[PDB]
Amino acid sequence: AATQEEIVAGLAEIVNEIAGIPVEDVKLDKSFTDDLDVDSLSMVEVVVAAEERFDVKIPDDDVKNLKTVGDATKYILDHQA
Template identity: 65%
Template sequence: MNTVQEEVRSGLADIVNEIVGVPLDEVRPEQSFADDLDVDSLSMVEVVVAAEERFGLTIPDQAAAGMKTVGDAIGYIVANR
């Protein structure tokens, strides 16, 4: 993982920790938001909104719906910053 990807992963870990209480070191690219991190649909909306604010971008609903894993979110954010 390069520096930009790690910065985004770290930021997402902070967001997930704040919203659902998952320890920072458990938020890894291969983790599924729903299955591994227990992020339900309402919490996922909060994650997306917080990520938009933190990383200064807009994440369309269709793109957000495709973010099943932390890695999916990292890839989208890195590609669209």
């Protein structure tokens, strides 16, 4: 559905409405609850929306097992079509 940069870009669309980050900020050298506004519990609202956005399905387990957006993209961009 999107490539690495586009995954990140798509993520940021939701992270902008949830927390409020600049959609020019969230690039590959970012992490969610580290380099973002830290939605924290609200990040679950991000990921659930992101699943459908990128044609993936991310288990609650994997969500907390991933780290950066460069790391998260690995699971996403690979599992999607």
